[PDB]
Amino acid sequence: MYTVKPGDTMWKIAVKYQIGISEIIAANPQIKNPNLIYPGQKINIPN
Amino acid sequence: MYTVKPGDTMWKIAVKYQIGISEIIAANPQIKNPNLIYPGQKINIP
Amino acid sequence: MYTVKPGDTMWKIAVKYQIGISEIIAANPQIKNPNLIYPGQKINIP
Ligand SMILES: CC(=O)N[C@@H]1[C@@H](O)[C@H](O[C@@H]2O[C@H](CO)[C@@H](O[C@@H]3O[C@H](CO)[C@@H](O)[C@H](O)[C@H]3NC(C)=O)[C@H](O)[C@H]2NC(C)=O)[C@@H](CO)O[C@H]1O
């Protein structure tokens, strides 16, 4: 549900959606490490 | 067939040369982490 | 309070510590250019 933008970190995404980082991680169990994601990939955000 | 220069990122090389970001990443599976590239590295242009 | 590993960038260190790039930049005003950190350099992680 969010397309990663250049420079984004998980904290920035968490700030934008006002949700904890661990909730975003739990929505994406296929991700090996968020340090491998690149801009233009889309991650799921639980509402 | 592009040599990384200081200051480059994979997104900047894709935007500057008009290559899609998923295409440049898929052309370069030898880059373990697309966020970490170094000057002098050669990357493939699809 | 953290030693830069070969292969670290400020963005990778921020993502490891669950913080943002501005926060790690703010903590390190001795770093002239946040894109350029060196192996073995000591930085602050707040
Ligand atoms: C896929 C994508 O574009 N990701 C973005 C990241 O690339 C970008 O981080 C910056 O990445 C470059 C390239 O890896 C880093 O430069 C490297 O930095 C190290 C440590 O200083 C240095 O040894 C390398 O020589 C140098 N390489 C080059 C080619 O100059 C740069 O430091 C990263 N910047 C930061 C602040 O961590 C991040 C952040 O802009 O965004 C991703 O979206």
Side-chain angles (χ1 to χ4, degrees):
Chain A
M1 26 245 174
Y2 176 69
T3 297
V4 176
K5 295 176 69 225
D8 282 347
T9 58
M10 295 305 309
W11 187 88
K12 189 160 201 206
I13 297 173
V15 158
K16 205 150 176 320
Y17 283 93
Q18 319 204 269
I19 195 159
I21 290 172
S22 61
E23 294 157 276
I24 296 175
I25 297 177
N28 299 268
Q30 91 288 20
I31 296 187
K32 180 170 186 201
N33 187 319
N35 75 11
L36 289 166
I37 298 165
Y38 61 84
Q41 299 199 287
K42 196 160 167 201
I43 63 173
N44 291 82
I45 308 293
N47 170 9
Chain B
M1 288 271 309
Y2 167 76
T3 298
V4 175
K5 301 163 193 293
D8 283 347
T9 65
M10 288 298 282
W11 173 261
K12 285 178 37 171
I13 291 166
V15 171
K16 178 165 176 183
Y17 295 116
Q18 302 184 49
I19 302 157
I21 185 59
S22 299
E23 291 75 16
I24 198 165
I25 293 312
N28 292 283
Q30 82 286 352
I31 306 179
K32 296 170 175 85
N33 180 334
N35 300 293
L36 305 174
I37 59 171
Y38 293 85
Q41 186 172 347
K42 310 291 198 92
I43 66 151
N44 306 125
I45 304 295
Chain C
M1 59 167 295
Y2 174 87
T3 297
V4 172
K5 294 181 172 71
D8 277 338
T9 63
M10 295 281 274
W11 177 88
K12 189 176 176 187
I13 294 165
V15 171
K16 178 154 71 179
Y17 285 104
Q18 307 231 313
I19 60 172
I21 194 78
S22 295
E23 178 167 20
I24 199 175
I25 289 167
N28 287 284
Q30 71 289 0
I31 299 179
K32 216 167 127 63
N33 173 354
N35 299 306
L36 282 80
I37 54 178
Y38 298 92
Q41 179 175 348
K42 308 305 165 205
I43 63 163
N44 303 315
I45 302 307

